[PDB]
Amino acid sequence: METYEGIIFACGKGGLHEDARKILQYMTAKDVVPSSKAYTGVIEAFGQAALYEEALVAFNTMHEVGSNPSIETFHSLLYSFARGGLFKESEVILSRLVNSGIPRNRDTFNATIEAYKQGGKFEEAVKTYVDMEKSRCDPDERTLEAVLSVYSCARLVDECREQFEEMKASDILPSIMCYCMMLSVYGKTESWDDVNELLEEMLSNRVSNIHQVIGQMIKGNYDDDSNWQIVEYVLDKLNSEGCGLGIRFYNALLDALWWLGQKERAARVLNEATKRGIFPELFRKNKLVWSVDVHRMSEGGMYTALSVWLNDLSDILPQLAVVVSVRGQLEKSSAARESPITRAAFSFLQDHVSSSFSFTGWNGGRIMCQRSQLKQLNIVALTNS
């Protein structure tokens, strides 16, 4: 029990779903009933790879073997759903947590804000933060980062200033993720004065090494063959808290680069993430489907993903080219086609390949291009400002 749970935790931490599945099969093949904690590690790994179907099967199997889910199990699902913006499934857990006798802790509130944010529900995201303070609790550093992303996403420059300065008002030294979100909201409004003001703060950074290297590489100082090894050195050091922290770091970084005009640099940063296992669902290239999955990405990251995907399309035929913007129960509804990600991807595709990618009549969160229309198709310019 101790060895099985130890290995599965590592698989769930690093998002190695294939290894986690084999440990579960090995335990069953030896007539061993895995513990409730062991299944939670398997559920964690599937959520790291956006394999929601296999994650909910393991959750279903927990009750079958009598290993009822613990509080940590309902957190593995919430963080898995939060990254994809599946607030419909997040509310199912929340409506289940109140019935299961589990009070809402702080971690539950953070996932709720993150799920609503990624799902485009900006009004409901701040309401959770509004209702969180009424219930007392104690917002942590990620909660401040959770609500800062909401304001940064909906282009609130003055709200983002107040949120960001208060982070350092308590001598917290906000992480590199919050700095990259400041660059996005300043880069979205073309506020080039504030961008240079924040960059000089990240250039000195005598205390934190990651801010210095990442801040330097954004400006383009580290774009040399030998000078890209230092940037890679930081990425390998950050590639030790698992895929959970990595996806948050790359989403903010690509968002900052795209809004600052460093669109060619964002292409190489995304290429650095994929080889490290980040965004394993991003691309599929077989004879049937050529797909790009952007439901767990930021707006800047999605644009970078589409730009590379479109350029690679023109190089080469599959039966279909699809863009997965909504991946959940919201697909079977009209709300998915009104999602901010779905509209942004379609708007991005409209003025890059003319009217070649149209919606689907059978799914709200898909943007397809038939094989016949693929014949009638760089397509996107990737340059640094």
Binding site: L56, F59, N60, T61, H63, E64, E89, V92, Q329
Partner: peptide, 17 residues
């Protein structure tokens, strides 16, 4: 006379919805 001739799958496997 009357003595003659000796007289759970499909559970916990539903749609999450």
């Amino acid at each position: 006379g009357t003595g003659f001739n000796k007289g759970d799958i499909l559970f916990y496997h539903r749609e999450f919805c």
